Design a protein around this ligand. Structure first.
Ligand SMILES: CC(C)C[C@H](N)C(=O)NS(=O)(=O)OC[C@H]1O[C@@H](n2cnc3c(N)ncnc32)[C@H](O)[C@@H]1O
Ligand SMILES: CC(C)C[C@H](N)C(=O)N[C@@H]1[C@H](O)[C@@H](CO)O[C@H]1n1cnc2c(N)ncnc21
Ligand SMILES: [Zn+2]
Length: 860
RNA sequence: GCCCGGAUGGUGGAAUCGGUAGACACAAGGGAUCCCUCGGCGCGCGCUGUGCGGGUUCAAGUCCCGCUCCGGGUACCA
C-alpha cells in the first residue's frame, strides 16, 4: 500500500481479479438463498452516459449489499441490440447495422468493466443474435395458434415520395427530416397481439404489487383506463349502414344534440364523394401525425357531413359531423356529443353554432346556466321525457335497460388500452414468422424453418429494407407449394419483454426456458430502471410474464416483486438548421453559452459558427446528442469516485440535472479514508477490544459507529436513499479523524470502526474497499465478507435532546434524561433565560409536549 | 391538451409518522494538506426565510384548495 491513493493502479487490477476468479458468476445454488437484482439492459448506441451509470451503480450497490448479507445474488447484463438508430448510423457511416452494433457492444462492455459492476458475464445476451430471437419467433407462432394474435389495419406516418414508413421521432415540425415533403396517414395491415385480453388481470394485480411505487401503478391504471359504459346504435336516413358509439354517460343521452365522427370513418368517406368541403377536410386530416400529443393540442375543427342520424328515444334528426378531436382508435370511431355537459363538445357546439340542450340539473336542484361553460358534474335529470327526476345511478340503468329492450344498445366494458401492434417495416429487427402461401392463405412459419434468420451482411440504400428490396429472400416452400414469408420485423419491445427470463438459462439449447433454472431465480426481487419505462415497457414486461405462466413455463403471476424507477439524468440539448432542413444536434461540450442573471441560457453558438436553438434540459441520449461520457471522469478521478458521486448527489427516484460540481468532495473523501487506514495500519496489529472497560468518549464513539451501521443498513435496504447513507458514513469518518489513536483500546476501537466503514462503502466504491479490506487484515475478499450488524447495547442512550418552543419558535435547547416526566422538563426549560424572557407578564394557556423531543408553550 | 412527478442557501441536497429548516458535500472569501466563516435584513441579540396566492393547526418544506415554471410518458426513440 502506497501513501497516495492512485485509482489507475488499484481499479484495473481488482477488475482482473473478478474476471479470473469468476467472483460474480453464479449458478442455481439451492444451499444459498437466492436474489435476482435485475437492471434494465441497454441499447448499444455507442458510448455510455451518466444516465446509464446512475442506473447500473444503483443496481450494483444493491447487488453487492445483498451478497454481503449472504445470498446467491444474480446481477446479469445483456444488450437490447435491435433498433432504429443503427440504421440511421449505418447509412451515414457507410456500414451495415450489425457490425456497427457489435462494435458498440464491445466498446460499452469495456466501459462497464472499467466501472467495475460485478456482473455475471457468462450469462451475457445479445438480442440481435438468432440464438436469442429464435425463441420469440417460436413463441409468436404459438400465440397465433392460441388466437391471441390477429391482423388489422393501422395508421402509419408515410412520406409519399420515398414510399417509406417513418417513426414519430423521425417527423419534425410535421415534416420529413431528410427531404422537403409533408407526411401523411396511410392505413396499412399489421399484426397485433391481444393485450386487451389480459387487461383486467394487469389492472387488478397492481393491488398485489405493494412493493411497486404508487406513481408507476397509478400511471398504468390511467393508461389501461378501464371503463363501464353503453354502446348505442343509430339509424341514418339516406345511408345503408348504422353507427354505434360508446359512452360512459347514458344518463345524459337525452341531451345528445349531434354525433361527432372521426376522419377515416366510412360515413365521412361516403359523404365526401358528393360533399366537396368534407373532401377537403378529410385530406387536411391526412396531415395529422399519428400521435395523441398533436391530436389534442391542435384546434378542434369539423365539417357537417349532410347525413342526419335518428335519435332513438326522442326521434329527432340530429346532424352527423366529421371531426378531428374524435379518435378513430379509441371507442368505435364515433361519439354521442352532449355539448351541454361536456367541455370538449361545448366548445365544438359553440364554435359551429349547434344546439346546446340541458338535461342535467345542477347540485342545487335547478336549471343550469350554460352561457360561459358546460356543467361537467352529475345530478338529477330534467327535460328528458320519461327519465325525469332520476339520479345518476337510476338514469344510467333506466336508459341502458330501455335501449337494451329496444335492441339498439347494450352495456359494454371498454379500455383505453389498444392492442400491441408489433409489425415494423424496417430492416434491423427480428423477422415476423408468418408465411403467405400461393393459395392466398396466411399461416405461421413451420417449426423446421424457424428461426427466420435476418441476414447481417447487407447493403442499405436508406429508403428501403434489403430483405424487402431483394425478391429472392422472401421465397420459401410450405406444405408443398411456393410461399412468401413476412419481410416486416418485430417491435424492439418484443425482445426486451422476456430477456429477464432468458438470463436464468441463456445457453439453453433445448427450449425457450429451462423451468428448473427459471423457477429458482424468478420472480425478480428488485428491478432497477428509468421512470420513462413506467408504462410502455413494464406493461409489456408484465403481460409477457403472464403469457409464459399460461404456457406452463413459470410459477409466479408477476415478474418483479419490487420496482425502483430511478429519475432521469437530464442535460442541455442544442441543434441548428441544416442546408436541407436537417436537425444537426450539437453536444453541450461543443456549445459555447452565455447565461442569464437567474441561471437560464440566453445565447448559444457552436465552435464552427452556427446559431444554436436551445431546446432545454432533456434526458441524455444518442438522438438529441446530449449524453456525457463517463470515460473522461473515470480516467481522471476513478470509477469509485464517479460511482460515489452519482449516488451521493441525489436520491435515486428524483430527477437529476447533470453537472460535474461535487465530484471533488467524493474524491477528497476517498483520500481521507485511504489516509486514515494508512495511518492506522502503519502502527501495526491491534489489541482485542475490551467492551466494558472504555472511557465515556470511547463509548460515545462506539455508539456512533453502530448507529451509523443501523442507519446505513436501513437507508440502503429498506429506503434506497443512498445519498443519506453515504452522508452518514462521512459524519462517522469526520468523527473518526478527530479520535485520538494513542492507547491500545483506541486502536482496538479504530479497528472495529474502519472494518465497518470499509464494508459499508464497499457497495458504492468496491475497488478501493477491496484493497483496504486486505490492509486491515480482514478475512478473505471483501465481496464474500459479512455485512456489519449493529450491537443494541452499544447504541444505548442515557439522555436526550428536547427543543423548547414559545408560540412555535425555538428559544432554547436542553439535555434531559430519557425517563423524565413533563413536570421535570418544564422546570428544566423554565430555568433557561431565553424561555423565561418570553414568559414574564403572560399566562401559559396551553403546554404541548412531544415525549423526549419537543415542548411548545402557548402564551397569552 | 391529458396522465405522473419535481421546485429548499451561489450549487446538489438533509429534515424517515405535522414537531430544531439547511445535515452531508460543492463553489466562494480569509488564515496556515489543515483550520475559520458562509440563507437574507438590522450580533454572547431580534425579525424573517423552503417557487407563487389563500386555508387548516399550538406547530406546515411536510396536509388541503387555487396558480406559475420545469421534467417524464402520450402507443414507431429505446
Ligand atoms: C428494458 C428495455 C426496454 C430498456 C431499454 N433497452 C433501454 O432503456 N435502454 S437504454 O440504453 O436506453 O437505457 C438502459 C437503462 O438506463 C436508463 N436510462 C436511459 N437514459 C437515461 C437517462 N438519461 N437518465 C437516467 N436513466 C436513463 C433506462 O431507463 C434503462 O433503465
Ligand atoms: C356526457 C359526455 C361524457 C358525452 C361525451 N360526448 C361522450 O360520449 N364521451 C365519451 C365517453 O364518455 C368517454 C369514455 O371514456 O370518452 C368519450 N369518447 C368515447 N370515444 C371517444 C373517441 N373516439 N374520441 C374522443 N372521446 C371519446
Ligand atoms: Zn421524405
Amino acid at each position: 500500500m502506497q501513501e497516495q491513493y492512485r485509482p489507475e493502479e488499484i481499479e484495473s487490477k481488482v477488475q482482473l481479479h473478478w474476471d479470473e476468479k469468476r467472483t460474480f458468476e453464479v449458478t442455481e445454488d439451492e444451499s444459498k438463498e437466492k436474489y435476482y437484482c435485475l437492471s434494465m439492459l441497454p441499447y448499444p448506441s455507442g458510448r455510455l452516459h451518466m444516465g446509464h451509470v446512475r442506473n447500473y451503480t444503483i443496481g450494483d450497490v444493491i447487488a453487492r449489499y445483498q451478497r454481503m448479507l449472504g445470498k446467491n445474488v444474480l446481477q446479469p447484463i445483456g444488450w437490447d441490440a435491435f433498433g432504429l438508430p443503427a440504421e440511421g448510423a449505418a447509412v451515414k457511416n457507410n456500414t451495415a447495422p450489425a457490425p456497427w452494433t457489435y462494435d458498440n457492444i464491445a466498446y460499452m462492455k469495456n466501459q462497464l468493466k472499467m466501472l467495475g459492476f460485478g456482473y455475471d458475464w457468462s450469462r451475457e445476451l445479445a438480442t440481435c443474435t438468432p440464438e436469442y430471437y429464435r425463441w420469440e419467433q417460436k413463441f409468436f407462432t404459438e400465440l397465433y395458434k392460441k388466437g391471441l394474435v390477429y391482423k388489422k389495419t393501422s395508421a402509419v406516418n408515410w412520406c409519399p415520395n420515398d414510399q417509406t414508413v417513418l417513426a414519430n421521432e423521425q417527423v419534425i415540425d410535421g415534416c420529413c427530416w431528410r427531404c422537403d415533403t409533408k407526411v401523411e396517414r396511410k392505413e396499412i395491415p399489421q399484426w397485433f397481439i391481444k393485450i386487451t385480453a389480459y387487461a383486467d388481470e394487469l389492472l387488478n394485480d397492481l393491488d398485489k404489487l405493494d412493493h411497486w411505487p404508487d406513481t408507476v401503478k397509478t400511471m398504468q391504471r390511467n393508461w389501461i383506463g378501464r371503463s363501464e359504459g353503453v354502446e348505442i346504435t343509430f339509424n341514418v336516413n339516406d345511408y345503408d349502414n348504422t353507427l354505434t358509439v360508446y359512452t360512459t354517460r347514458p344518463d345524459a343521452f337525452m341531451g345528445c344534440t349531434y354525433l361527432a365522427v372521426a376522419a377515416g370513418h366510412p360515413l365521412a368517406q361516403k359523404a365526401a364523394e358528393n360533399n366537396p368541403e368534407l373532401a377537403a377536410f378529410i385530406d387536411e386530416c391526412r396531415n395529422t401525425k399519428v400521435a395523441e400529443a398533436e391530436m389534442a393540442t391542435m384546434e378542434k375543427k369539423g365539417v357537417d357531413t349532410g347525413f342526419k342520424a335518428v335519435h332513438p328515444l326522442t326521434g329527432e334528426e340530429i346532424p352527423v359531423w366529421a371531426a378531428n378531436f374524435v379518435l378513430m382508435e379509441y371507442g368505435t370511431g364515433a361519439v354521442m356529443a352532449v355539448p351541454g355537459h361536456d367541455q370538449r363538445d361545448y366548445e365544438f357546439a359553440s364554435k359551429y353554432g349547434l344546439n346546446i340542450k340541458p338535461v342535467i340539473l345542477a347540485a342545487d336542484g335547478s336549471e343550469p346556466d350554460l352561457s360561459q361553460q358546460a356543467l361537467t358534474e352529475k345530478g338529477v335529470l330534467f327535460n328528458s321525457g320519461e327519465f325525469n327526476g332520476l339520479d345518476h345511478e337510476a338514469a344510467f340503468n333506466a336508459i341502458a335497460d330501455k335501449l337494451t329492450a329496444m335492441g339498439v344498445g347494450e352495456r359494454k366494458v371498454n379500455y383505453r388500452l389498444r392492442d400491441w401492434g408489433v409489425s415494423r417495416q424496417r430492416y434491423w429487427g427480428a423477422p415476423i414468422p408468418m408465411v403467405t402461401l400461393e393459395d392466398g392463405t396466411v399461416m405461421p412459419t413451420p417449426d423446421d424453418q424457424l428461426p427466420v434468420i435476418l441476414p447481417e451482411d447487407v447493403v442499405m440504400d436508406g429508403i428501403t429494407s434489403p430483405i424487402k428490396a431483394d425478391p429472392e429472400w422472401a421465397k420459401t416452400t410450405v406444405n408443398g407449394m411456393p410461399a412468401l414469408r413476412e419481410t416486416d420485423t418485430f417491435d424492439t419491445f418484443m425482445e426486451s419483454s422476456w430477456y429477464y427470463a432468458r438470463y436464468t438459462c441463456p445457453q439453453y439449447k433445448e427450449g425457450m426456458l429451462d423451468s428448473e433454472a427459471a423457477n429458482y431465480w424468478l420472480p425478480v426481487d428488485i428491478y432497477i430502471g428509468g421512470i420513462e419505462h413506467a408504462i410502455m415497457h413494464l406493461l409489456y414486461f408484465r403481460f409477457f410474464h403472464k403469457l409464459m405462466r399460461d404456457a406452463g413455463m413459470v410459477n409466479s403471476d408477476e415478474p418483479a416483486k419490487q420496482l425502483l424507477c430511478q429519475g432521469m439524468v437530464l442535460a442541455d440539448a442544442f441543434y441548428y438548421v441544416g442546408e436541407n432542413g436537417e436537425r444537426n444536434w450539437v453536444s453541450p461540450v461543443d456549445a459555447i453559452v452565455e447565461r442569464d442573471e437567474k441561471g437560464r441560457i440566453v445565447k448559444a453558438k457552436d465552435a464552427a459558427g452556427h446559431e444554436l436553438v436551445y431546446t432545454g434540459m432533456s434526458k441524455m441520449s444518442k438522438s438529441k446528442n446530449n449524453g456525457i461520457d463517463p470515460q473522461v471522469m473515470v480516467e481522471r478521478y476513478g470509477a469509485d469516485t464517479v460511482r460515489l458521486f452519482m449516488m451521493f448527489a441525489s436520491p435515486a427516484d428524483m430527477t437529476l440535472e447533470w453537472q460535474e460540481s461535487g465530484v471533488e468532495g467524493a474524491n477528497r473523501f476517498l483520500k481521507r479514508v485511504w489516509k486514515l487506514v494508512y495511518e492506522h495500519t502503519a502502527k501495526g496489529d491491534v489489541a482485542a477490544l475490551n467492551v466494558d472497560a472504555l472511557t465515556e468518549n470511547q463509548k460515545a464513539l462506539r455508539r456512533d459507529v453502530h448507529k451509523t451501521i443501523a442507519k446505513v443498513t436501513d437507508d440502503i435496504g429498506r429506503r434506497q436513499t443512498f445519498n443519506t447513507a453515504i452522508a452518514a458514513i462521512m459524519e462517522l469518518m469526520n468523527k473518526l479523524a478527530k479520535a485520538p489513536t494513542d492507547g491500545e483500546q483506541d486502536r482496538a476501537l479504530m479497528q472495529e470502526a474502519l472494518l465497518a466503514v470499509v464494508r459499508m462503502l464497499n457497495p458504492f466504491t468496491p475497488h478501493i474497499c477491496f484493497t483496504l479490506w486486505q490492509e486491515l487484515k480482514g478475512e478473505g475478499d471483501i465481496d464474500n465478507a459479512p455485512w456489519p450488524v449493529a450491537d443494541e447495547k452499544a447504541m444505548v442512550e442515557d439522555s436526550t435532546l428536547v427543543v423548547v418552543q414559545v408560540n412555535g419558535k425555538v428559544r432554547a435547547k436542553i439535555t434531559v434524561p430519557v425517563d423524565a416526566t413533563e413536570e421535570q422538563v418544564r422546570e428544566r426549560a423554565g430555568q433557561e433565560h431565553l424561555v423565561a424572557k418570553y414568559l414574564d407578564g403572560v399566562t401559559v394557556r396551553k403546554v404541548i409536549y412531544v415525549p423526549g423531543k419537543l415542548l411548545n408553550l402557548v402564551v397569552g
